[PDB]
Amino acid sequence: MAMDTFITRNFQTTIIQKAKNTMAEFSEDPELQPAMLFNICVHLEVCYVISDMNFLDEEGKSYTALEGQGKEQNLRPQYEVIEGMPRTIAWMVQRSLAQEHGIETPKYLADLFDYKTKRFIEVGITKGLADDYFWKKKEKLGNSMELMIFSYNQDYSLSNESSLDEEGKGRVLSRLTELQAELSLKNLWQVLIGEE
């Protein structure tokens, strides 16, 4: 099975197209770098999954999607998802958010903004070990963003003060575990170069 085919059979078309658009923004070709396309797809999916799990009411109280059902009109998502927007627009969303909350605009483009903590978030996904990648991304980012790191081997690196709960962590990690297993069944795994 081609990685191209793996991608088609394992991700939503919406995810795939955004991933291709990102590679277009980066002038890279999906056909020539399927590992990169896969990586972008997984990253996108993680960001959306994280952002659909928490809501905040007007008073700042935190709800899960289930707990909040019937009240959603009166809730707003806890995280703004910046990843997956066209990049040119994303930069301006980031700036707008920073300005609205009286905080510094980060130098680099974030993946999420946490309305509760008023922090930008960078999400990382590794085939290696989460803490190693945390330290690497720290060199670039400093304290400019919260890092949320997940790995395909149930490893992760999250702030003690992250808004993501056990259930949400579990949901991200299970999907990654599931992808690793599916990749392996097609012998696409030990081929893979990940985000690290």
Partner: peptide, 19 residues
């Protein structure tokens, strides 16, 4: 999982157009 994506894409459009 698809709902997470569908909803996320809606929210992004909502945000951008409110700016």
């Amino acid at each position: 999982l698809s709902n997470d994506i569908s909803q996320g894409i809606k929210r992004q459009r909502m945000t951008v157009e409110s700016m």
